[PDB]
Design a protein around this ligand. Sequence first.
Ligand SMILES: CS[C@H]1[C@H](O)[C@H](O)[C@H](O)[C@@H]1NCc1ccccc1
Ligand SMILES: *[C@@H]1O[C@H](CO)[C@@H](O)[C@H](O)[C@H]1NC(C)=O
Ligand SMILES: [Zn+2]
Length: 1014
Amino acid sequence: CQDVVQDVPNVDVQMLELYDRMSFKDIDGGVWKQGWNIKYDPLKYNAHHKLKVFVVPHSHNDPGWIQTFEEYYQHDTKHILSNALRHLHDNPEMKFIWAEISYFARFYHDLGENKKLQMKSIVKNGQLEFVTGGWVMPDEANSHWRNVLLQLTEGQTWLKQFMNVTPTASWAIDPFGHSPTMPYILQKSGFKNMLIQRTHYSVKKELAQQRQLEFLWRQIWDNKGDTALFTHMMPFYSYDIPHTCGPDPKVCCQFDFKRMGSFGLSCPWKVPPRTISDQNVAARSDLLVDQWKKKAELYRTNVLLIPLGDDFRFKQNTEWDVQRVNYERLFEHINSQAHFNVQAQFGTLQEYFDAVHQAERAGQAEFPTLSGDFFTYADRSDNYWSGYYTSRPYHKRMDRVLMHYVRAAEMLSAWHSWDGMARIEERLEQARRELSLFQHHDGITGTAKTHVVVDYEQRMQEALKACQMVMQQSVYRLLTKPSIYSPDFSFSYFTLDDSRWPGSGVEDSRTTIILGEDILPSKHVVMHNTLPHWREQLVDFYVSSPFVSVTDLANNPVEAQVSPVWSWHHDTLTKTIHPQGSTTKYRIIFKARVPPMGLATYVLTISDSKPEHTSYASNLLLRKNPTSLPLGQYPEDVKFGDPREISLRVGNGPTLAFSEQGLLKSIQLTQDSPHVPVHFKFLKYGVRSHGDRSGAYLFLPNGPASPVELGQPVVLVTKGKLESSVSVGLPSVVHQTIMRGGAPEIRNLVDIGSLDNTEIVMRLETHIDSGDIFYTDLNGLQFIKRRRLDKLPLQANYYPIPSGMFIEDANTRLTLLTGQPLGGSSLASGELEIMQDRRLASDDERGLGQGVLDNKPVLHIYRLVLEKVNNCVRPSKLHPAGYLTSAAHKASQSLLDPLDKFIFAENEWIGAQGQFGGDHPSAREDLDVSVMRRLTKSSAKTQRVGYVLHRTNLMQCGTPEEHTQKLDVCHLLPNVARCERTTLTFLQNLEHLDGMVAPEVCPMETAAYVSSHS
Ligand SMILES: CS[C@H]1[C@H](O)[C@H](O)[C@H](O)[C@@H]1NCc1ccccc1
Ligand SMILES: *[C@@H]1O[C@H](CO)[C@@H](O)[C@H](O)[C@H]1NC(C)=O
Ligand SMILES: [Zn+2]
């Protein structure tokens, strides 16, 4: 295994180093506004060395943006595909590339058989070529790598099954900035090439000057280069026709033949295209070839890529004709005039890359190596696209909930083969497809119109219901005596109980377990642990009595704590935000211990008085002018006091101190250690009163944030043996700090209400001597070093925080893990900040045509880990990566993949069993079974199960922590007959494994294996 910590890779271009050296000046470069006047030597190409030009027709089809997926499909995409089929069928030399499989599958299944056969023929002959082949073209900033892989697999599995092709070239022309997680996943999925477009205009200029727009993109920790994927970065401001033929859009726009008038389009530069004729073809070719030769100067080979397309293009038959006939006249002239020394033709993306690599092998070019990312993108001036790291945060959080539910449903149901009548495959396909659709670069990014966001939310809600159905049928089958099991595949044997989604104060969706002497004495509950190691975690349920005790199925008592059910209310009469307690529902909390990828059953039983093994939390309300807070049968009366500082400690864990406003002020790790200043603060950013305004994409603050005026907020302190907390009702946020013995959990119920033109930020202030350095993650996969640059505006220093961020000095580190992707930064030494929500009345002029005014309450969740790191073996100062400690990685897993909780629905569960998975191996902590998916239906004689195994890399800090079992996923199911290593999409077998044993992977690697069973 390669060492991912101690060896700094030697690359030609390292993006953090490039950023440190670049000046980012925005000067007027002439017709190429953000470049320079390109010059070329006319003698460079001659009869023995011609410029080969591939014009690649395309149509960018968003699966939701200004219209819903179905609306665009009916109004636009179905016509584009039907006419592409007809025009390619009838014109053998015409070509077209297609990226979004969600639309293609929707179209293909509606075609008659004669047309399905015509479509398969134009794909098999190479006229229509799929690029990437994912369900969507995903966002690369907020997406979790597990969902990027999920959507890639959904689209490619469909293509292999119906079109018999697997793309090896990727096309990503619209995500707003680009992540190295893409080449990481693509290279492990059989790809050989990829293309990107939205990178900072200063980066395009810098790389163009050095002819470094094509590069071998490797991961930041990869010393050897085996993760490298050839990447082509487009050079210009857009992928539309005016910015793809060459540097001068006023000239290129004249070669978009849809802009002469009858289609309702025109050229902003005021010179229209003209139909090509024998009288103008020489002057028109002179102009076009000059643009091509200028573009070719920015690259190293004699093969030039010329995309020809725009959003929802190629819809009308007349549009196909006008583009094709005019380009054919140009090619016939250009290719016959030896003096141009050009051979131009329609082509596909793969044809371009194959020709580039033929040139490379002929020794005509060598390509530079590059590591790093391409965030934060700016398309012009100071317009940095960091707003969408936070826009529509409710749905960003929903993405992570559904991510976990899909994994848990696929894993729980993979253990058995299911009859078709159980509809398991049907429900899982629906859930995977709705989550995959939301990875679109207008889905999770929060950049779609309001009604489109509602469509994505409804789709995801249906997907969550599908996952619940599959999970609960699976639990019932895994935990019921086989000869007793009698399933009704439409019945709900269990209901899921989720304490954090939609969350307290967001939706009263949780069921109360109703017990009573005259109705039901007890209830079975079951916990599932999708992680491959034994895990303990506190779990809570709502119950109708405070006198409840817990037992495991061997009837051993389990220690429990009962606390009240507190809800917060914005009291419009008293104008205060304060909590109300229930007098008939209570929370019971206990530690569940669950096997690796397993299930554990417990029983909750009511008694007439306080149970021996259940304790009760105390509650203290701090506010002036208190009023009584009765709690029914709860045995401890609520206490009251004036606001004051307070301190809490659960177990042997840290001691936390809070201000009189209920906000953390310090953390003391152990009895003797110092009280380290760690202060939470809420602030607000506004919008500019002149110039460009913030919107769904752009963050254009009117200066540094201002503290939110807090008044004298109401603070609620609950102190328990198993769990304590401090909650405060601030304007726009009920902020909670929860302690269970280790790093605290933070929950914010964020309701920005009607605060227009406001972005609310949560900041941590410490005295850690971080300087200008901080770390943020990329797609939940890796942590990358960031350097704050005062030569760039505030919004340029914001980066995606898809799952965590940290600051550190020689001795101390503070890591904030998230349960949802949000934007954040470290704007001063010792600080971390993360945006909670943003409400914007203005549009940011990118085409969305609305502000962001559809905010709704969202429960954001986090873990806050303060640690001593002086003994940790960390990368050197020049390494571009950072790594989590064991505690921080486990805290991230507690947010993203918590235990699942099931409540038995009926009164009695006959044949109930106490555990599943007790014999499953408990794998080393850095290893995860990211995906477990049965790949065959029940009619297959040979069953196949696919696993994606990911190993992260955790810092060595002196903890022996060992004794674990080797995990061989190929032997998790019985009767294994074969084990194969495959691409991550499971679509190609790469190695037949000896002994049917799937080896574990190296740190930072991901592998896939498929086991076959007789
Ligand atoms: C506003 S940017 C982007 C949206 O968020 C959608 O994804 C849409 O495809 C659009 N493309 C880029 C584009 C815009 C205008 C003209 C040509 C291309
Ligand atoms: C699928 O493509 C392969 C490669 O061209 C070809 O050999 C095969 O016949 C095609 N159809 C089948 C058999 O799946
Ligand atoms: Zn788009």
